[PDB]
Structure 1
Amino acid sequence: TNVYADSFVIRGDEVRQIAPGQTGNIADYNYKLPDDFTGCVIAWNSNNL
C-alpha cells in the first residue's frame, strides 16, 4: 500500500541493533523496529562521507 523509507546514521557497531526485537542504546532510545516488522534494513559504511 505504501513503503516507508526511514534513514539515519549510526556507528558500525550499532547496525546489529536495527533489527526486530533488539535492545541497546540505539534500539531502546533512538529507533525501535516492531517485533513483527516486515521490511529490509540496508546499511553501508559512510566513513568517506
Structure 2
Amino acid sequence: FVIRGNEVSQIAPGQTGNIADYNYKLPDDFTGCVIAWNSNKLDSKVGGN
C-alpha cells in the first residue's frame, strides 16, 4: 500500500494510528519485514496526486 512518510512507523505490531486500527492491523505475534521507500518521483504530481 501507499501511506505517508510519518505513518511508516505505524505499520508494526501493537502500533498506534488511524491506518493501524481502521485500515491495516498487524497481529502481535507478527514475523516478517517491512519495506518502506519514498515514491516522490512516481506517486506524486505537481497538481496533486
Report TM bin, short chain: 0.7 to 0.9
Runs of 4+ in 1 over 4 A off after TM superposition: none
User: TM-score w.r.t. structure 2 length?
Assistant: 0.80
Unaligned runs of 5+ in 2: 43-49
Higher helix share: 1
The Cα offsets for residues 1-49 of structure 1, whole Å up to 9 and x where unpaired, read as: xxxxxxx000001001001111211101111110110110101000111
Q: How many residues align?
A: 42
CA distance in 1, matches of 2:24, 2:40: 21
CA distance in 1, matches of 2:20, 2:36: 15
Report percent identity of matched pairs: 93
TM-score under structure 1 length normalisation = 0.80
Q: Who wins on radius of gyration, i.e. which is larger?
A: 2
For 2:38, which of 26, 42, 45 is the aligned residue? Answer: 45
- Mark the runs of 5 or more structure 1 residues left unpaired by the alignment: 1-7
What's the C-alpha RMSD, in Å, of the aligned pairs?
0.6
